[PDB]
Structure 1
Amino acid sequence: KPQKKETYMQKRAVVVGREERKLRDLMQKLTTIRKEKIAKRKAKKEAQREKLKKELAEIEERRREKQKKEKKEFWEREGKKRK
């Protein structure tokens, strides 16, 4: 729950001035630009990953057609030459 009563440890603290205030503000603004930065970079690595697995799926379809044509022509060959 949110606390509506300012406790003593909140009524006790040190109000901090301009130098450390601006060190806090600069440090926050850097951290937000880092978070949006890595959100972009991993969005684009995810997209390129999806293209990679897509075309790997198509090339394994063609590998399956090599399997079926090769085994079918085989059992033509020995399938005829056993009789």
Structure 2
Amino acid sequence: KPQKKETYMQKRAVVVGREERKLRDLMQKLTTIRKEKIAKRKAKKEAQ
């Protein structure tokens, strides 16, 4: 069940900086483009 109250381990979380958020966003974008590229390559190989 999705928790509705905010726990103490969620309250005490450090606000992350700007450079680490830029690295996080870059890693998100690279992982999505990798997943889409892999799905396209697998579809082409299944057709062949």
TM-score range relative to shorter protein: over 0.9
Which deviations, in whole Å up to 9, do the C-alpha atoms of 1:10-68 show, x marking residues without a partner?
00010001100000000010000000000000000000xxxxxxxxxxxxxxxxxxxxx
Aligned to 1:60: none
- 4+ long deviations beyond 2 Å: none
Aligned length: 48
Query: Structure 1 CA distance, aligned partners of 2:35 and 2:7?
Result: 33
Flag the structure with higher helix content.
Answer: 1
- Mark the runs of 5 or more structure 1 residues left unpaired by the alignment: 48-82
- Mark the runs of 5 or more structure 2 residues left unpaired by the alignment: none
Greater radius of gyration (CA): 1
Query: Structure 2 CA distance, aligned partners of 1:29 and 1:6?
Result: 29
Q: CA RMSD in A?
A: 7.4
- The secondary structure found in structure 1 opposite 2:16 is coil
Aligned-pair CA distance for 1:2? 0.2
- The secondary structure found in structure 2 opposite 1:2 is coil
- The secondary structure found in structure 2 opposite 1:13 is coil
Q: Percent identity?
A: 98
